[model samples]
Target: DDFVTIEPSEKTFKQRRTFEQRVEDVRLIREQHPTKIPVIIERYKGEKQLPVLDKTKFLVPDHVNMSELIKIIRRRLQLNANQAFFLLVNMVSVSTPISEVYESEKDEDGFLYMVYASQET
Candidate 1:
């Protein structure tokens, strides 16, 4: 339910954006960030065949927002189309629509640290 996030109403104090709008806003936040940025150092679970989801530190992307990254992983792994794969973080699936990905305020936290996963969080 948190995935269907809420942003302060652009129109008014009590006003709010639609569900689709919120999702799009999150998508934009993800897209606007630099891909070259490594949000997190090698934290874990870069590949789809992940066991203990939170186990690796990678400059790679398996984040819910990085569709291309996931696609690339699948291609590299040769995972079948029917074979489901996910970018997990903390043993949770991050594929929720309107899913939230946090950005840190600290600079030492790296330019990027894409700690990820599914909607279960």
Candidate 2:
């Protein structure tokens, strides 16, 4: 039978002590919390798209009326009539330029909603 012997050097002992101190500090901090719950951070791996701007001309024909335009905008933004109307009104009053408004479809019928404009500062 053969056995492999392991030896710990002074530097190894110091590294072990440092690791133990870190663990103790973490435990102390965790004890201060109400619950000892583990947390996880995740990254989303998906495609991203560029935003649209209101000042940009619509790709649709000019013959589209305001009502139709509103419908298209609301649909694109995924916002209901009431929400879209109020947001547009507020933007106009505040003289805030809307860079983009669009809609997204959801699995739930009632969940279809609009995204308001976002701008870089």
Candidate 3:
């Protein structure tokens, strides 16, 4: 399991001020209408810790058959039947979280990168 921690700091004060200014501007614009709707703004100040669960553990079966495992790997890799079968037989075996694997993509230069969630690491 991987955990993510968010500690509030004054580092983003300027950015947050800009955001609040924009929100206030929007509220002012909305208030110009003939029928104005009440606008509410909420802000939170604190540090928080969040948990990220490894999704791969859910994928592995108690008893896995080689053929079925190969099929699963192929589907995840988005490879054709022949390519998937060959990859399954030739590639080195390694385990990674399914979320990480599926969310990752290769760049134009073939460099792989994974997406990071803002709420979790």
Q: List TM-score per model, in order.
A: 0.32, 0.24, 0.23
How far out, in Å, is residue 119 in model 3? Answer: 40
List runs of model 2 lying over 4 Å from the truth: 1-55, 86-121
Residue-by-residue lDDT tens digits, candidate 1, 1-121:
4555333322321124454654554456457654423333221333323222232223433344546556755565556787665544313233432123334221232333343332223
CA lDDT of each prediction against the hidden true structure: 0.38, 0.31, 0.32
Question: Candidate 2 — worst ten consecutive residues by lDDT sum?
Answer: 38-47
Worst 10 residues of 1 by lDDT: 6-15
| Candidate 3 weakest lDDT stretch, 10 residues | 48-57
The lDDT of model 3 is: 0.32
Reference-based lDDT, residue 20, model 3: 60
Residue 7 lDDT in model 2? 29
Model 3, 51-117: lDDT tens digits are: 2212211223324433444455446545564431232210223354322332242222221222111
Candidate 1 segments exceeding 4 Å error: 1-35, 39-65, 89-108, 111-121
Give the number of the best model, judged by TM-score: 1
lDDT at position 45, candidate 2:
16
For model 3, state the Cα shift of residue 7 in Å: 30
Q: How many residue pairs collide in each prediction? A: 20, 11, 0
| Residue-level lDDT tens digits of model 2 in 1-121 | 9975442232321234465664554456446642322111111112112223233213323233334555655566565544523222112222211222211221121111222332211
TM-score of 2: 0.24
